Design a protein around this ligand. Structure first.
Ligand SMILES: *[C@@H]1O[C@H](CO)[C@@H](O[C@@H]2O[C@H](CO)[C@@H](O)[C@H](O)[C@H]2NC(C)=O)[C@H](O)[C@H]1NC(C)=O
Ligand SMILES: *[C@@H]1O[C@H](CO)[C@@H](O[C@@H]2O[C@H](CO)[C@@H](O)[C@H](O)[C@H]2NC(C)=O)[C@H](O)[C@H]1NC(C)=O
Ligand SMILES: *[C@@H]1O[C@H](CO)[C@@H](O)[C@H](O)[C@H]1NC(C)=O
Ligand SMILES: *[C@@H]1O[C@H](CO)[C@@H](O)[C@H](O)[C@H]1NC(C)=O
Ligand SMILES: *[C@@H]1O[C@H](CO)[C@@H](O)[C@H](O)[C@H]1NC(C)=O
Ligand SMILES: *[C@@H]1O[C@H](CO)[C@@H](O)[C@H](O)[C@H]1NC(C)=O
Ligand SMILES: *[C@@H]1O[C@H](CO)[C@@H](O)[C@H](O)[C@H]1NC(C)=O
Ligand SMILES: *[C@@H]1O[C@H](CO)[C@@H](O)[C@H](O)[C@H]1NC(C)=O
Lengths: 224, 312, 73, 34
């Protein structure tokens, strides 16, 4: 318990030291909106194929019966930019809706409970998450489970004791050269081969490769 | 069949709208704000087209070499592994899909090459297939381990409700059914795909439409701007040049908008393929009827031109 | 200096046969970086750590330790 | 349910948890061997 508590506090300090040194997903949505708003003010500085940019300049030098064509070119020229800015914002709104629905599914699975889908809330076995507030977004601090050290052991698919094959339920039979233990595929926990973790089915001569191993039989010495 | 990327096209306004004259460049300064938006939109497509490949194929940062031991307990893995008889990294299957699915740059419609070619995508699928047959799921969620295939199939059966005692009783039966399933897919694919062809036919018809837009007049006396300048003076034919510019600007605004919807459909399929890569390939997906019709055990992803295939 | 790459022409950067992790994407499987004085070099990017995984029918690997990490999305 | 053997298991020693209490086991195997 003191090892997991120390590894959790070191993981929070490594994220806080990395975030203090900018983000990309929370900056591209702002830079695209800032350049789109700066483009609309630049559209008012163009003429769209006319003699002036603003409609107030042509009305002071020419009569509206004469400059009616230049006004319609500025209206249709600004209507094309208004139809472009709305269409460009609708694709960005669909990208926001696609990311908000993806974040809502991750909130109901990674945060609200344990997500059974592996490699979904991040690289590694997800346990839980800690969502925090973000400007125009949201962040997630998941708790992953990745292995660091490992060793190689000789395994066996079944155990032949008296003519019947023994198959495990959650773990796998391991051996480091002279002994025989059983452990899961996620953590090394050596245990004695007992009856409560194994079962019998059929005969022994069903596997192409099998070895001979004895059972501790934790029920025999108790009835004496 | 799920696509992850498509072709990259970079359209200019000055090469596509204006030809070989200086009178078109004077009127293009009034529409320079429209090309700042169209150039940034086509630049945003090319980065998104190169970022979707790094989210599906680049799941791990280690290249897993294929083991020389081909004895996997009666299973035939020569169809998914690259054979050393050919210099290419594609397997027989991957090579059958390259020839199954099938100038445009003369009018300024140049095609930019992607970041990763077909050889590096084939190397990414062979690296994921080497880690699946040797570690299964620990290589995508941590460091690499070693585990035999049969033992690996016993853990995939436990996720759907099947105990692992029946696997070791008919191991020669399931190994013969697995080799018969690969031969049935290879015989069906050798006889075209739909999801990998509509993304190419829509881009081919859109590129053939832009060259046809140059053959129209847009309500004028000529199509090209070089014809009216030889018969009329630019002070007189200034209205005909502006009608050809706003006529081509409407087609350029339509081609960029049509490509952005196709880029959103590619992004929606690449994110769907990335979730299937991390669940059906990288481990066992607990969601039933997600990786196909039936109880999913594992998958075998291969390389595809402008896409990716999955053999669950 | 001048290197005829598969994606066009990259000039002003020498080519080296060694492969490292690239940062600036260029295209066609070749990147451009600044390594060792030090000059801008162009080389083929590495697809990952080239390592061999020992596969056997009677060998398993069980992890004995773990590290609790936080993935920021 | 009564604390039995079929739902529990042992691993290591007792002095591993920072907070623990003393409790007895029903042992549903002892009265059957008599
Ligand atoms: C695995 O499948 C391949 C099919 O590609 C088998 O290769 C064929 O083997 C037969 C038998 O000699 C030959 O007649 C064919 O010419 C082979 N085809 C190719 C493309 O090589 C291979 O034998 C199978 N392996 C096992 C162990 O069944
Ligand atoms: C698993 O790894 C952790 C992290 O390195 C080990 O914890 C360290 O243990 C050493 C000696 O026991 C201490 O000096 C360090 O201070 C510990 N670090 C932390 C962050 O707690 C742990 O011992 C390893 N466990 C095994 C079984 O190898
Ligand atoms: C590893 O093998 C040695 C051989 O004598 C044995 O003493 C030791 O107990 C084994 N390791 C474990 C964890 O049982
Ligand atoms: C593993 O395969 C080799 C090669 O066929 C064989 O000699 C060996 O007996 C096999 N091991 C087991 C445990 O079946
Ligand atoms: C011990 O293993 C050998 C080889 O698998 C087998 O022939 C023999 O019957 C086994 N011994 C017993 C008592 O089952
Ligand atoms: C890199 O090494 C290979 C090894 O044969 C050689 O052929 C090639 O010319 C070298 N390239 C450079 C740029 O030195
Ligand atoms: C709970 O925490 C309090 C505060 O430290 C402590 O006094 C108490 O003993 C704890 N209870 C248990 C069961 O550990
Ligand atoms: C009862 O609990 C106390 C406090 O935890 C402990 O010191 C004592 O050893 C326990 N009794 C037995 C018989 O274990």
């Amino acid at each position: 318990q003191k090892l997991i508590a120390n590894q959790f506090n070191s993981a929070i300090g490594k994220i806080q030291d990395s975030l203090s040194s900018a983000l990309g997903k929370l900056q591209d949505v702002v830079n695209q909106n800032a350049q789109a708003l700066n483009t609309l003010v630049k559209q008012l500085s163009s003429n769209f194929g006319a003699i002036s940019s603003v409609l107030n300049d042509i009305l002071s030098r020419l009569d509206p019966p004469e400059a009616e064509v230049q006004i319609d070119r500025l209206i249709t020229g600004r209507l094309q930019s208004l139809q472009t800015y709305v269409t460009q914002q609708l694709i960005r709104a669909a990208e926001i809706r696609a990311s908000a629905n993806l974040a809502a599914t991750k909130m109901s699975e990674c945060v609200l409970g344990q997500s059974k889908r592996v490699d979904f809330c991040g690289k590694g076995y997800h346990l839980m998450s800690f969502p925090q507030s973000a400007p125009h977004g949201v962040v997630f601090l998941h708790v992953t489970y990745v292995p660091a050290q490992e060793k190689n052991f000789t395994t066996a698919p079944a155990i032949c004791h008296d003519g019947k094959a023994h198959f495990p339920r959650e773990g796998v039979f391991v051996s480091n050269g002279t002994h025989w233990f059983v452990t899961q595929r996620n953590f090394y926990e050596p245990q004695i081969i007992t009856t409560d973790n194994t079962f019998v089915s059929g005969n022994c001569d069903v596997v192409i490769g099998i070895v001979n191993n004895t059972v501790y039989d934790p029920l025999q010495p108790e009835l004496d | 069949i799920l696509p992850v990327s498509m072709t990259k096209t970079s359209v200019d306004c000055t090469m596509y709208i204006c030809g070989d004259s200086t009178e078109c460049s004077n009127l293009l300064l009034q529409y320079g704000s429209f090309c700042t938006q169209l150039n940034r939109a086509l630049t945003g497509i090319a980065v998104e087209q190169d970022k979707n490949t790094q989210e599906v194929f680049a799941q791990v940062k280690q290249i897993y070499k294929t083991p020389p031991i081909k004895d996997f307990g009666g299973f035939n893995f020569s169809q998914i592994l690259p054979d050393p008889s050919k210099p290419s990294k594609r397997s027989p299957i991957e090579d059958l899909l390259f020839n199954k699915v099938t100038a445009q740059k003369f009018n300024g419609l140049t095609v930019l090459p992607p970041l990763l070619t077909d050889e590096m995508i084939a190397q990414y699928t062979s690296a994921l297939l080497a880690g699946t047959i040797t570690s299964g799921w620990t290589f995508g969620a941590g460091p690499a381990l070693q585990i035999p295939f049969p033992m690996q199939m016993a853990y995939r059966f436990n996720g759907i409700g099947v105990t692992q005692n029946v696997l070791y009783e008919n191991q020669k039966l399931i190994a013969n059914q697995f080799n018969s399933a690969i031969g049935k897919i290879q015989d069906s694919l050798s006889s075209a795909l739909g999801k990998l062809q509509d993304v190419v036919n829509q881009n081919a018809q859109a590129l053939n439409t832009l060259v046809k837009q140059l053959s129209s007049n847009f309500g004028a006396i000529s199509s090209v701007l070089n014809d009216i300048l030889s018969r009329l003076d630019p002070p007189e034919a200034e209205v005909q040049i502006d009608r050809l510019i706003t006529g081509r600007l409407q087609s350029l605004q339509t081609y960029v908008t049509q490509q952005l919807i196709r880029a959103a459909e590619i992004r929606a399929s690449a994110n769907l393929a990335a979730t299937k890569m991390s669940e059906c390939v990288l481990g066992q997906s607990k969601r039933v009827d997600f990786c196909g019709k039936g109880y999913h055990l594992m998958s075998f992803p291969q390389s595809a031109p402008h896409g990716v295939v999955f053999l669950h | 200096n001048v290197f005829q790459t598969r994606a066009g022409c990259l000039i002003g950067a020498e080519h080296v046969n060694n492969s490292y992790e690239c940062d600036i994407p260029i295209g066609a499987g070749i990147c451009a970086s600044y390594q060792t004085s030090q000059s801008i070099i162009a080389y083929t990017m590495s697809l990952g750590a080239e390592n061999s995984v020992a596969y056997s029918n009677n060998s398993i690997a069980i992890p004995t330790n773990f590290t609790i990490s936080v993935t920021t999305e």
